[PDB]
Structure 1
Amino acid sequence: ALDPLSETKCTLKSFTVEKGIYQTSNFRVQPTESIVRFPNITNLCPFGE
């Protein structure tokens, strides 16, 4: 996880890489926030009954 070059060597399991293009991982995107929305309820449930 130092640089993309080292990520390639760990993908192919070798210290010497040949000329070409290689796949490493996916471009995941972590979310920044979390939205929470509920209806405007005001009653409390009658669980005493």
Structure 2
Amino acid sequence: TKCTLKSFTVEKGIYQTSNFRVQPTESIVRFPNITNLCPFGEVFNATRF
């Protein structure tokens, strides 16, 4: 209340000081069920372009 008033003395009443809340607890990452590799690296290396 002192900082949101920018005053060392805080007067009587209702004061909306903190506008905060909201909180991370865990972490879900869902990627699809894919396990195969693919030719994304072997289209650079060699001869016939």
Per the normalisation by structure 2, the TM-score is 0.64
Give the structure with higher Rg (CA). Answer: 2
Deviation, 1:39, is 1.0
Q: % of aligned pairs identical? A: 100
Paired residues in the alignment total 42
Consecutive unaligned residues in structure 1, runs of 5 or more: 1-7
> Which protein is richer in helix relative to its size?
1
Per the normalisation by structure 1, the TM-score is 0.64
**Shift >3 Å, 4+ stretches:** none
Consecutive unaligned residues in structure 2, runs of 5 or more: 43-49
Superposition CA RMSD, Å: 1.6
Change (3 A) 1:12 1:48: closer
